[PDB]
Design an enzyme around this catalytic site. Structure first.
Site, PDB file in Angstrom:
ATOM      1  N   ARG A  45      -3.084   1.676   3.389  1.00 57.14           N
ATOM      2  CA  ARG A  45      -1.907   1.135   2.834  1.00 57.14           C
ATOM      3  C   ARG A  45      -1.580   1.742   1.629  1.00 57.14           C
ATOM      4  NH1 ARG A  45      -0.730  -4.519  -0.178  1.00 57.14           N
ATOM      5  NH2 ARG A  45       1.199  -5.172   0.805  1.00 57.14           N
ATOM      6  N   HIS A  49       2.296   2.916   0.930  1.00 56.87           N
ATOM      7  CA  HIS A  49       3.336   2.663   0.016  1.00 56.87           C
ATOM      8  C   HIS A  49       3.522   3.498  -0.825  1.00 56.87           C
ATOM      9  CE1 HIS A  49       2.958  -1.502   1.383  1.00 56.87           C
ATOM     10  NE2 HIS A  49       2.714  -2.148   0.076  1.00 56.87           N
ATOM     11  N   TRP A 188      -5.483  -9.336  11.461  1.00 53.19           N
ATOM     12  CA  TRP A 188      -4.782  -9.293  12.662  1.00 53.19           C
ATOM     13  C   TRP A 188      -5.816  -9.001  14.002  1.00 53.19           C
ATOM     14  CZ3 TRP A 188      -3.440  -6.736   8.098  1.00 53.19           C
ATOM     15  CH2 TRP A 188      -2.493  -6.712   7.839  1.00 53.19           C
TER      16      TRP A 188
HETATM   17  C1  HEM Z   1       7.733  -3.347   8.636  1.00 51.56           C
HETATM   18  C2  HEM Z   1       6.601  -2.717   7.887  1.00 51.56           C
HETATM   19  C3  HEM Z   1       5.210  -3.225   7.188  1.00 51.56           C
HETATM   20  C4  HEM Z   1       5.209  -4.719   6.690  1.00 51.56           C
HETATM   21  C5  HEM Z   1       6.202  -5.823   6.423  1.00 51.56           C
HETATM   22  C6  HEM Z   1       3.757  -4.819   6.445  1.00 51.56           C
HETATM   23  C7  HEM Z   1       3.207  -5.997   5.745  1.00 51.56           C
HETATM   24  C8  HEM Z   1       2.019  -5.842   5.334  1.00 51.56           C
HETATM   25  C9  HEM Z   1       1.231  -7.039   5.015  1.00 51.56           C
HETATM   26  C10 HEM Z   1       2.123  -8.172   4.161  1.00 51.56           C
HETATM   27  C11 HEM Z   1       0.001  -7.020   4.470  1.00 51.56           C
HETATM   28  C12 HEM Z   1      -0.767  -7.670   3.616  1.00 51.56           C
HETATM   29  C13 HEM Z   1      -1.269  -7.202   2.382  1.00 51.56           C
HETATM   30  C14 HEM Z   1      -2.052  -8.199   1.520  1.00 51.56           C
HETATM   31  O1  HEM Z   1      -1.976  -9.427   1.361  1.00 51.56           O
HETATM   32  O2  HEM Z   1      -3.053  -7.483   0.841  1.00 51.56           O
HETATM   33  C15 HEM Z   1      -0.159  -5.495   4.970  1.00 51.56           C
HETATM   34  C16 HEM Z   1      -1.438  -4.799   5.217  1.00 51.56           C
HETATM   35  C17 HEM Z   1      -1.639  -3.667   5.442  1.00 51.56           C
HETATM   36  N1  HEM Z   1      -0.562  -2.838   6.057  1.00 51.56           N
HETATM   37 FE1  HEM Z   1       1.312  -3.257   6.298  1.00 51.56          FE
HETATM   38  N2  HEM Z   1       3.401  -3.744   6.781  1.00 51.56           N
HETATM   39  C18 HEM Z   1       4.015  -2.832   7.298  1.00 51.56           C
HETATM   40  C19 HEM Z   1       3.945  -1.366   7.565  1.00 51.56           C
HETATM   41  C20 HEM Z   1       2.758  -0.685   7.348  1.00 51.56           C
HETATM   42  C21 HEM Z   1       2.553   0.598   7.948  1.00 51.56           C
HETATM   43  C22 HEM Z   1       3.446   1.431   8.486  1.00 51.56           C
HETATM   44  C23 HEM Z   1       1.247   0.852   7.713  1.00 51.56           C
HETATM   45  C24 HEM Z   1       0.241   2.011   7.909  1.00 51.56           C
HETATM   46  C25 HEM Z   1       0.854   3.531   8.722  1.00 51.56           C
HETATM   47  C26 HEM Z   1       0.623  -0.155   6.850  1.00 51.56           C
HETATM   48  C27 HEM Z   1      -0.879  -0.543   7.015  1.00 51.56           C
HETATM   49  C28 HEM Z   1      -1.425  -1.751   6.345  1.00 51.56           C
HETATM   50  C29 HEM Z   1      -2.512  -1.720   6.112  1.00 51.56           C
HETATM   51  C30 HEM Z   1      -3.944  -0.551   6.130  1.00 51.56           C
HETATM   52  C31 HEM Z   1      -2.957  -2.901   5.588  1.00 51.56           C
HETATM   53  C32 HEM Z   1      -4.303  -3.626   5.267  1.00 51.56           C
HETATM   54  C33 HEM Z   1      -4.653  -3.500   3.686  1.00 51.56           C
HETATM   55  C34 HEM Z   1      -5.917  -4.182   3.129  1.00 51.56           C
HETATM   56  O3  HEM Z   1      -6.391  -4.814   3.951  1.00 51.56           O
HETATM   57  O4  HEM Z   1      -6.170  -3.775   2.218  1.00 51.56           O
HETATM   58  N3  HEM Z   1       1.639  -1.383   7.113  1.00 51.56           N
HETATM   59  N4  HEM Z   1       1.074  -5.103   5.734  1.00 51.56           N
END
Ligand code: HEM
Ligand SMILES: [Co+2]
EC number: 1.11.1.5
Length: 291
Positions: A45, A49, A188
């Site tokens: 993530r 970012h 998820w």
């Molecule tokens: C419309 C695009 C995106 C939205 C709205 C979205 C939203 C979020 C949300 C809100 C979570 C939870 C964060 C937390 O509470 O700590 C998150 C987790 C995560 N996202 Fe996304 N995300 C998107 C795109 C992406 C993309 C493109 C990737 C990787 C290529 C990414 C990878 C991750 C990862 C790996 C986490 C888990 C991080 C954790 O467990 O430490 N996301 N995302």
């Protein structure tokens, strides 16, 4: 504006495999993090970012400049829940002070994906730290409470088409949401320290119900204790996205190839590689090194 990759003075593939190895070994060393999720998802993530700040229209933001190291960007509300991954990488930067910040943050995500049994992702060095005043303002990362039109529109700014978007979202097989970071709660899927196509299978196979959460945001929940952000759900609400979700749910091999390309592109948007720049590097896992 043009950012030209510049290879770190006299460094080569083995220097970068060392840094890989260091991150990989620390992933193992700290694998108790977040009741054994480990730090992998957070590093992926993080790398997204740092890259996701890019604006293709004027080449602002992007991974090249390493701007996340400045407090304006690392204190972005959108970056809540990445501070531990950042701190994770800090000593490794200290161990390898010749690597640039953007190269380091980018490599953290490649490393995490491979060590979590994902696809090989070719990686290229040469990002060059850029000063404080080049840090992108807050607000460039996507909101989760949105729909397919938002998602599609949003990702156009990152030069990503429908396949690239659906493929990149597949990283949500990793890790989880936490109310304290993002206002959302849950994972998820079940194997969230393993890189697989589970996100797509769960989207398609679980029964989902719109529910409000403890942060007053709405999210889609399954009785198995999984969840989907409204933007995740939008991938089956949209016919064109739905087709590709089905494609990856049925073929993980295909998802892996598409993700690998999209993620490398994401990590390299904004960067111009000179004609005699070295070819992309593919790093061996610890496993492949018998380490
Ligand atoms: C419309 C695009 C995106 C939205 C709205 C979205 C939203 C979020 C949300 C809100 C979570 C939870 C964060 C937390 O509470 O700590 C998150 C987790 C995560 N996202 Fe996304 N995300 C998107 C795109 C992406 C993309 C493109 C990737 C990787 C290529 C990414 C990878 C991750 C990862 C790996 C986490 C888990 C991080 C954790 O467990 O430490 N996301 N995302
Ligand atoms: Co977390």
């Amino acid at each position: 504006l043009v950012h030209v990759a510049s290879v770190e003075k006299g460094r080569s593939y083995e220097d970068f495999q060392k840094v890989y190895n260091a991150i990989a070994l620390k992933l193992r060393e700290d694998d108790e993090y977040e009741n054994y999720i480990g730090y992998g998802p957070e590093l992926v993530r993080l790398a997204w970012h740092i890259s996701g700040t890019w604006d293709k229209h004027d080449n602002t933001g992007g991974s090249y400049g390493g701007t996340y190291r400045f407090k304006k960007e690392f204190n972005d509300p959108s970056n809540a829940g990445l501070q531990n991954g950042f701190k994770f990488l800090e000593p490794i930067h200290k161990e390898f002070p010749w690597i640039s910040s953007g190269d380091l943050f980018s490599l953290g995500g490649v490393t995490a994906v491979q060590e979590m049994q994902g696809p090989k992702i070719p990686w290229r060095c040469g990002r060059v730290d850029t000063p404080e005043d080049t840090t992108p303002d807050n607000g460039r990362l996507p909101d989760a409470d949105k729909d397919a039109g938002y998602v599609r529109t949003f990702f156009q700014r990152l030069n990503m088409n429908d396949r690239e978007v659906v493929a990149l979202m597949g990283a949500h097989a990793l890790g989880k949401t936490e109310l304290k970071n993002s206002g959302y709660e849950g994972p998820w899927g079940a194997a969230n320290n393993v890189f697989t196509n589970e996100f797509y299978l769960n989207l398609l196979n679980e029964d989902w119900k719109l529910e409000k959460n403890d942060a007053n945001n709405e999210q889609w929940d399954s009785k198995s204790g999984y969840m989907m952000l409204p933007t995740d759900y939008s991938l089956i609400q949209d016919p064109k996205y739905l087709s590709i979700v089905k494609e990856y749910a049925n073929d993980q091999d295909k998802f892996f190839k598409d993700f690998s390309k999209a993620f490398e592109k994401l990590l390299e948007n904004g960067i111009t590689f000179p004609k005699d720049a070295p070819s992309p590097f593919i790093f061996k896992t610890l496993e492949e090194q018998g380490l």
